């Protein structure tokens, strides 16, 4: 909600609370998503200020707090800051921002990540360009300087991050994305490339330096309908863990396919269906294997903008014999949401 809109400056505090639960057979080790109560509340602030008619500056930050944790030493587990960045929007030339934000490839992967709770599994966090990361500088053009309506492009530089874990570390990277929206229809294409750090190469799995991601997305949203299809391929970019070996690293090659079909009703209802798949190739000692392969069937009732309820049933098609100890169990989630 907009709490402060004065002096040519406007502040929008946006926050929500989600009472959530996951069900599944067994304790939930093998469940796709998990099991139990997954309630969490997010708080964030967005701020703008028009310095000049043609130049305005903005800053946004978001944090997520989990409620499933106890009040002991594990209170902070799963608590983090998702987004924290700033930037300025010029009138037509474009806009430039910096901070902790989504990677260009997320722009392409946004079409599939429309599910209530699950979805966007391929778009891992703290990954090169697919998810939200810290240390990015992004430039964006809307409608190509107002030349061509609906066609906008963005470019992003990624400062190297040498962290303790290869899963969370990266190096110098670059990426770009283009999106043409016309009359409701939408097309997008994004590409990102970066260098893997010594820790990443040193990992038992994974080989090579050039970590590459790219994706193409298509969609149509109108008439209370939303269809979407994103196909993305990556090299040495996706993280992978082997429970049998209890060893991690990156995937020499990965193909990911996402498909979504959601309908919406006037009476605050939106049933959803989603197919997903990700196959890794040239895995060290496991050849080619499927990381995730499932169906979605879910729904969301929108009492209003500030109140909603939803359910999602994930038909995990992964088999138990999978060569990475992956969870071969179905799962379901039921959630209730308040948001201001």
């Amino acid at each position: 909600a907009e709490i402060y809109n004065k002096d040519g400056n406007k502040v929008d505090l946006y926050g929500k609370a989600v009472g959530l639960h996951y069900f599944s057979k067994g304790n939930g080790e093998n469940s796709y998503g998990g099991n139990g109560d997954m309630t969490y509340a997010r708080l964030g602030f967005k701020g703008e200020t028009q310095i000049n008619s043609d130049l305005t500056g903005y800053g946004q930050w978001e944090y997520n707090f989990q409620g499933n944790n106890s009040e002991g030493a594990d209170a902070q587990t799963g608590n983090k800051t998702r987004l924290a960045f700033a930037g300025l929007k010029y009138a037509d030339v474009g806009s430039f921002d910096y901070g902790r934000n989504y990677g260009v490839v997320y722009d392409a992967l946004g079409y599939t990540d429309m599910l209530p709770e699950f979805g966007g599994d391929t778009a891992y966090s703290d990954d090169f360009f697919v998810g939200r990361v810290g240390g990015v500088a992004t430039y964006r053009n809307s409608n190509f300087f107002g030349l061509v309506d609906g066609l906008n492009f963005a470019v992003q530089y990624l400062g190297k991050n040498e962290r303790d874990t290869a899963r969370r570390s990266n190096g110098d990277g670059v990426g770009g994305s283009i999106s043409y929206e016309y009359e409701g229809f939408g097309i997008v294409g994004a590409y990102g490339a970066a260098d893997r750090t010594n820790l990443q190469e040193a990992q038992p799995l994974g080989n090579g330096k050039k970590a590459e991601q790219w994706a193409t997305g298509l969609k149509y949203d109108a008439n209370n309908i939303y269809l979407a299809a994103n196909y993305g391929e990556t090299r040495n970019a996706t993280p992978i863990t082997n429970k049998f070996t209890n060893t991690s690293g990156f995937a020499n090659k990965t193909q990911d396919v996402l498909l979504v079909a959601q309908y919406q009703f006037d009476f605050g209802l939106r049933p959803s269906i989603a197919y997903t798949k990700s196959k890794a190739k040239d895995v060290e000692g496991i050849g080619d294997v499927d990381l995730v392969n499932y169906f979605e069937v879910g729904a969301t009732y929108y009492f209003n903008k500030n109140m909603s309820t939803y359910v999602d049933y994930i038909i995990n098609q992964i088999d138990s014999d999978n060569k990475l100890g992956v969870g071969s169990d179905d799962t379901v989630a039921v959630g209730i949401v308040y948001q201001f």
């Binding site: 406007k10 305005t56 499933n68 989504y102 699950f118 599994d121 778009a123 939200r132």
Partner: protein, 64 residues
């Protein structure tokens, strides 16, 4: 200590909201002259979405 102060039992609510509507509370007028400001102007709004998009999409990449 001091937790008891206030802390109503039973259901929880404080006072009347400013407006009736769950999602449509404002002042008035519809049919618009396109002027953006007159008495026959509907929106009565500005600085619509001056700020840039901030990760449009659900954003629940993996799961809590």
């Amino acid at each position: 200590g001091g937790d008891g102060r206030g802390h109503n039992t039973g259901a929880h609510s404080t006072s009347g909201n400013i407006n009736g509507g769950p999602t449509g509370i404002g002042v008035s007028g519809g049919c618009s002259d396109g002027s953006g400001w007159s008495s026959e102007n509907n929106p009565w709004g500005g600085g619509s979405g001056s700020g840039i998009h901030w990760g449009g999409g659900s954003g629940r990449g993996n799961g809590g």
